Structure formats: structure tokens, C-alpha cells
Design an enzyme around this catalytic site. Structure first.
Site, PDB file in Angstrom:
ATOM      1  N   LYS A  31      72.675-118.503  59.696  1.00 10.16           N
ATOM      2  CA  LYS A  31      73.584-119.844  59.668  1.00 10.16           C
ATOM      3  C   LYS A  31      72.196-120.927  58.847  1.00 10.16           C
ATOM      4  O   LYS A  31      71.343-120.803  60.658  1.00 10.16           O
ATOM      5  CB  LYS A  31      74.865-119.934  60.256  1.00 10.16           C
ATOM      6  CG  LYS A  31      75.718-121.371  59.855  1.00 10.16           C
ATOM      7  CD  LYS A  31      77.009-121.508  60.567  1.00 10.16           C
ATOM      8  CE  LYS A  31      77.502-120.787  60.212  1.00 10.16           C
ATOM      9  NZ  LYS A  31      79.182-122.034  60.908  1.00 10.16           N
TER      10      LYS A  31
ATOM     11  N   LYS B 103      83.065-111.776  45.820  1.00  8.18           N
ATOM     12  CA  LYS B 103      84.352-111.761  47.243  1.00  8.18           C
ATOM     13  C   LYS B 103      85.218-110.834  46.264  1.00  8.18           C
ATOM     14  O   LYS B 103      85.816-112.104  45.945  1.00  8.18           O
ATOM     15  CB  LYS B 103      84.234-112.831  48.491  1.00  8.18           C
ATOM     16  CG  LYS B 103      82.548-112.351  49.132  1.00  8.18           C
ATOM     17  CD  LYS B 103      82.820-114.044  50.224  1.00  8.18           C
ATOM     18  CE  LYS B 103      81.709-113.875  51.041  1.00  8.18           C
ATOM     19  NZ  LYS B 103      81.930-115.209  52.271  1.00  8.18           N
TER      20      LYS B 103
HETATM   21 MG   LIG Z   1      79.052-116.999  51.923  1.00 10.81          MG
END
Ligand SMILES: [Mg+2]
Ligand SMILES: [Mg+2]
Lengths: 388, 388
Positions: free
Chosen positions: A183, A283
Site C-alpha cells: 500500500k 474482481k
Molecule cells: Mg486494488
């Protein structure tokens, strides 16, 4: 292979699974996975699907609560008693009375694939390949492996120490993960990526996930991150800043990957046409189900666009849908899929997905719920709504 | 002009107003306008805003019920006790914890403009002009009229008779409306538009609204409608089929107008860059509030893109926000705004908007709710939630 079934009964379970590893979610703590499971009944057969929205509205605006509302009051009643002729017709059916709300639609759509897979005694992977073929997916991209590779996703450490991140990079390598993504956000970017790249070597599959936290005028920060030579930068800008994402790509060497932007196959079409990005994350929940995911797969592979699979994540059940899909040739980097044992403890997930030397093998048994016993489902959750 | 206020109290009303003219909505009947009214309190001052979602999820996926959930459980608690420094900061605040959900955000955002307008004893129109100016809107587009022109919107007649539509075209002309738009869909297209054009003459402002019911491969139908020479075709294709909409525009003479596609200013930016369409509809609810609408106004007028205002419609209260905005020079065709008396009966709307010779005049009094008495609000609805 028949794709038709009559929806004799529908039920909704809320499942709750204690996380062995509470992780830093996008809105604070997260001790437990809380999800919805849609059960569709034909005669004595049952299909199961998962909707896994967050409890807070930071992702597409849908929450567990709004998802319940949509499902109970609109979507589940609409499908009751229906007898769709195909997966494509069922997709049309569920979209008709309901725009947006992709998590709700996904749980229902996936449950239908599970039901059809079981009724036909065939593997999800097999149904997907056939659908792909019927849709005219290129022969080369009907090829697959019998496993997916698994990558680690690392957050930003709460103590702001590079060494805390690096300890986690080391643990990920020892655990067998075949890829790391870290991240980032403005101010936590060049340095962590630099210390990570060297902890793993130039060779190791590595990317960033900024979660849309940068703007284009911060592009020089990306310029500086070019030295770490990672595979791509995942969703660095706002999901709707499509031309800015293309432009960032032109200002740096490291490619840009889309995640949040790819909300549907219609959007995928023009994103491919415009050459916004050559690397797409898929996704299933984000796009509202497996057929939509497959339509996006065709668009990508038609255009030489590289894919990789991600998850919200869901429980092992939702992950099954991605696991079959993500083994096809179009998918060229390790996927974000939670190994059951790590996150919930062995056998504690709704269904078990096992990571061995950084691989998760594709089930050959029928559908998604072949190994889910009713009593295990009832042990993890409760039926909160039903209608016959 | 101060743009700051402390949110001492928040309340939510559900209002219900019997329609004098039940109309053909997108999901059947519609005898009554059912809406939410957000009340924000600073000291003894009150701002009011409307969220007007549909009861069914066919528009962006939001419903009255999900809007209640979002408002009660997330958005209204988040703003309680806050003291935003500006309209722009309040916009950031409401988007932070909540993505999507534009109807919920709009009701809260608009209520804040109303509160600030009253606290400053200034007209909405005046605040909008100042904001426009601060944002760098071109001098020419800070110009305005003191009224908006009003257009009729006609549906597809349930008996499928052209004469039933034509009787309504005649009534609209007699009623003083300055523009007509007619609903179309495949199979109800060339003919109705032809019979309408001649009932009103080539001169009369006329357009179609297909509600995304066509695909690009039906373009020849649009070709045939070119003979009716209308001003534009409103949202003929799917809202996400942006390049298809540009392409349709290239195959015909009649311009294409965007409505549903324009969901935010970020989307507006790249839609302007790509030259998808030169005519945009602005609905404040669709874009999640007035500031967003104003940012879109700047983008359009920066690019020579023609605007016109529309409504869901809301009650007279929601319409107030559009009425002030839509009088500026950028708006060049008559707006879809319901005249109170027609739809609810005189004085029966939450606030009264009056159409005289096809014009609705812009209020000079402060804000949106200057003429809404508390007892009239309480007569039209009930407080369903509150917190201090
Ligand atoms: Mg992502
Ligand atoms: Mg419209």
C-alpha cells in the site's frame, strides 16, 4: 450442458467468521468477516453465492445493510419462481429491476452458476471455458493452468516504520507467496517501495496499490518510484479520472493498472478502445458477477491487455468463483486470494482454499459449494430471510 | 459572505404528496410524491434539502430505503456537531465517508446551501454566482435571466395511439410550455416524432428522450428521425456507452445529448475532453448536489457545451436548487421543472413554484426554504429520525 433451472426457493444467510489476523481495513479495525450467502433451490439441489460488501459505504457506496435491503425487498423476490433459460438470461433478469448494487447482484448471479454447475455435475472451470468459447474468446486464451499463483498484499504500518513493513515482506517470502504488493499514499511512497524492492531483489514480482490516493499533478512522485522497477502501479488516481490515468502512464516508465475504474464490461469496452491501461485487475464482486467478469476477460484478451485476479476479500466461497476464472491464460500475475488457514484458522472458513508453495489449485469437483456442508454453513451463520 | 456553520442538530422528514396527475413512471403507477427532507440546524436557523430517490432501484441503484439507511446510519451522524469552513469543505466532508449514494448526498449538501443562504440573508442565485466566480467561470457565463423557461415532458401513451400523444402535445401548447420532449423506445420512435413535429411546426423546440433504450446498431432508426429536425436526442444509448454515443452522433445530423452519463464533474471532464456530446443535461440530484452541478457548469461553458436543466422530479423544494442554477447563460433550452399547481394542486407542494406563460421566475429571497413554514412541512410529512 443445460443452463436452465427453476427457482423454487431462495434464502439469505448472514455469515460471521472471526479473523485470526485482524487486518488494517480502509475504515479501521476488522476482527471478523461478515458476509451474505445467497441460497437458490431447485428441487433438492442448492446453489450458493456470496455477497461481500463492506459495512461502511467507501466502496461503490454499497454496504452490508443496503445490500440486505436490495436483496430482501427487490432482487430475491424478483427471481423466486422464475425459470431462466440460460446464464445470460438470468444475468439480464437480475439487472432488469436493479441497476448498480453489484455486490447484491454478484451473490445472486454466482449462486446461479453454482446451482447449474452442480445440476450438471461439472466444474466451475469447465462451465467458464465453455461460456468463454461460446462468446468467441480466442483459442489461445481458452488455455489454462490447474492452479493460480498467490500474492501477498501488505498495508501501511501503523507505526510508520519502514522496518515493520520489511519484517512483513520477509514473512511473506518465507510463507511462499509468489508476489508482493504494498500500500502507498502520498508521503508513504518512494521510500517504502525502495526498501521493499531491495528486500526482495529486482527480480521479485512487486507492485504498488495507491487506492486512488494520488492526483496527476503528483506525477513526479511516480517518476521517482520508476527506479524500483515494479510491474505496475495499481489504481494510483481517482477511479473516474480515466484520461488522467492514461496521461500518468505517458509520463513514467512503470505501467498503470486499473482496478476500481473497471466497473463493468461496457466501461471495459471503451477503456480498451482508448488505451487507458494495458493491465487490468478483475474482481468478480466489483463487476457484479462471473459472466460480466468473463465478458471483461474477452475484451482484455482481444486487446492484448494483461489480467490478474483480486478479491475484496470474501470468504472462501466467493474466492471459488475467482479461483476457477483466474487459472486461464489471460491471467499473468499472481492473484489476491486469501488462504483459508492463514486468515481464519484451518477448516474455519466457509470452504477451504489451501495455498501450497504459493499456489492455490483449481477444484475439479462441481461448482463452488461441493465441499460446503449445510451444518458448517449453519455453524458460521444464520438464515435471516427466505421465501418459497 | 461566510460559508461556515456549526451543525447543532439534524433531522430527517419523510414527506408524502398526493399527485393530482398520476403519471407513467419507469416502474408503473405513481399516485404520490414520496421524498426525504433533511433539516440542518445552527442555533435558531434551519436549512432544508431534498433527497428524491425512486422506490425501485432502476436509477443508479439507489432507493428510498437505501437512502434512508445511508442517511440515518452514516451521513447524518457524520455531520452532527461538525463546523465546516466552506461549502467546498462540507462537500469534501460528505463524500469522505460515503462514495456513490448521490441522492443522499444531494439532500444533505443542498440543505447546507439553504442554511448558509439564510444565515447570510442572500439568494441562492447570488451564492451560486459568487461560487461560479470564485471557481473561475468565464465572465460571459456569470450572466443570467431572472426566470427559467419551462418545457413539457410527454410519455409513451398506454393505448399506443398516436392521437393520444398528439392530444397531449396540443394541451402542452395551450398550457404555455415553451418546449416539448417526447419519450421514445424502439418501435415507438419515427412515427410519434413525425406526428409531433407537425402538430407543433418545425419551429417549435422539440427533442426525444429514449432513456437508453437503443443500441448503436439501431442507428438507422435515428437516421430516419433526422427528418423531424429536432434539437437533439436525449440519452439514446446506455449511460456507460460513451464512445458509442459519440459514434452515433457522427452517423446522424441531429446532435446527441447526455443525461444519465454525466454522473459527476470528474466524468464531465473527460467527456468534454473526448467530445462525446455538445449538449448536456444537468440534474442536481444525479450529480450529488449543487457544487458538483456548478463544477460541471464550468466545464461545459469552458468548452462551448450547451446546457439545460432537468429534475427527477423532486418536490418544489428540490426544484428550487435547480431554478436558481438554471437561469444562468449557460442554460440555453427550457428546463424540466414541475409547476406546483399542475401536479399537486395550488399550494399543496412543499413550496410553490409557479409557471406563467411558460416561465418560472427565480426567487430573490434567501435560500430555498424562505417560504416553507414548519407547519406546512409537518402537514406534508413526518420527522422519522433526528439527533442533536
Ligand atoms: Mg486494488
Ligand atoms: Mg433524461
Amino acid at each position: 450442458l443445460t443452463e436452465s433451472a427453476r427457482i423454487d426457493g431462495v434464502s439469505l444467510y448472514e455469515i460471521v467468521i472471526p479473523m485470526k489476523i485482524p487486518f488494517q481495513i480502509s475504515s479501521g479495525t476488522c476482527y471478523t468477516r461478515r458476509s451474505l450467502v445467497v441460497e437458490i433451490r431447485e428441487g433438492d439441489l442448492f446453489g450458493y453465492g456470496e455477497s461481500a460488501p463492506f459495512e461502511e459505504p467507501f466502496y461503490l457506496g454499497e454496504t452490508l445493510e443496503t445490500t440486505k435491503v436490495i436483496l430482501k425487498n427487490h432482487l430475491l423476490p424478483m427471481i423466486l419462481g422464475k425459470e431462466p433459460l440460460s446464464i445470460e438470461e438470468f444475468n439480464h433478469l437480475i439487472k432488469n429491476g436493479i441497476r448498480g448494487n453489484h455486490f447484491a447482484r454478484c451473490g445472486v448471479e454466482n449462486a446461479y452458476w453454482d446451482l447449474i454447475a452442480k445440476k450438471n455435475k461439472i466444474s466451475l472451470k469447465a462451465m467458464i471455458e465453455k461460456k468463454m468459447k461460446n462468446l468467441g474468446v480466442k483459442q489461445e486464451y481458452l488455455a489454462s493452468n490447474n492452479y493460480i499463483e498467490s500474492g501477498a498484499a501488505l498495508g501501511i504500518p501503523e507505526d510508520g516504520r519502514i522496518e515493520t513493513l520489511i519484517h512483513q515482506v520477509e514473512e511473506s517470502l518465507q510463507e511462499g507467496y509468489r508476489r508482493i504488493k504494498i500500500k502507498i499514499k502520498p508521503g508513504w511512497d518512494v521510500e517504502p517501495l525502495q526498501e521493499t524492492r531491495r528486500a526482495v531483489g529486482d527480480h521479485f514480482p512487486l507492485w504498488t496499490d495507491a487506492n486512488s490516493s494520488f492526483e496527476l499533478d503528483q506525477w513526479e512522485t511516480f517518476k521517482a518510484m520508476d527506479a524500483a522497477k515494479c510491474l505496475f502501479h495499481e489504481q494510483p488516481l481517482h477511479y473516474e479520472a480515466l484520461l488522467d490515468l492514461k496521461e500518468l502512464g505517458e509520463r513514467i516508465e512503470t505501467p498503470i493498472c486499473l482496478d476500481e475504474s473497471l466497473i463493468s464490461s461496457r466501461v471495459a469496452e471503451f477503456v480498451a478502445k482508448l488505451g487507458i491501461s494495458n493491465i487490468w485487475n478483475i474482481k468478480i464482486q466489483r463487476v457484479g458477477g462471473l459472466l460480466e467478469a468473463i465478458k471483461i476477460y474477452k475484451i482484455a484478451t482481444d486487446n492484448g491487455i494483461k489480467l490478474w485476479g483480486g478479491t475484496m476479500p470474501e470468504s472462501g466461497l466467493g474466492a471459488r468463483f475467482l479461483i476457477s476464472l483466474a487459472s486461464f491464460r489471460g491471467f499473468v500475475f499472481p492473484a489476491d486470494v486469501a488462504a483459508s488457514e492463514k486468515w481464519y484458522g484451518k477448516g474455519n472458513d466457509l470452504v477451504e482454499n489451501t495455498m501450497t508453495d504459493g499456489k492455490i489449485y483449481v477444484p475439479d469437483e462441481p461448482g463452488a459449494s461441493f465441499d460446503m456442508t449445510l451444518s458448517h454453513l449453519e455453524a458460521l451463520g444464520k438464515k435471516i430471510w427466505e421465501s418459497q
